[PDB]
């Protein structure tokens, strides 16, 4: 008989870098609000 002492099997486990991983970022455009005095289209009429 032989003993597995020296030849024992190996388990594996990755060295995950999640602890130092950057996050996913969401973008939102800062709308030029119409609540603030934004301009409007100058629909014109004629006084005949």
């Amino acid at each position: 008989v032989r003993e597995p002492g020296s030849q024992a099997c190996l388990a594996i486990d990755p060295l995950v870098g999640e602890e130092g991983g950057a996050a996913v970022a969401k973008l939102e455009p800062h709308l030029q609000p119409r609540g603030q005095p934004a301009p409007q289209p100058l629909h014109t009429l004629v006084l005949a």
């Binding site: 990755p14 995950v16 870098g17 999640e18 130092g20 991983g21 950057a22 996050a23 996913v24």
Partner: protein, 52 residues
């Protein structure tokens, strides 16, 4: 499960796997959605993850 899938994609990208998902590939996916899907479905080497 959109939020959990975003977290999962963060996990995979951090660990070096190039993950293709619709929310991030929006620009290319917008040109032709079905073409975008077929690109990854046809390729045998691409691993597909099914989020149940």
């Amino acid at each position: 499960t959109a939020m959990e899938v975003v977290k999962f994609v963060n996990f995979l990208l951090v660990n070096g796997f190039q993950t293709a998902i619709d929310i991030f590939e929006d620009r290319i996916r917008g040109i032709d959605i079905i073409k975008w899907m077929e690109r990854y479905l046809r390729d045998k080497t691409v691993m597909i993850i099914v989020a149940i």
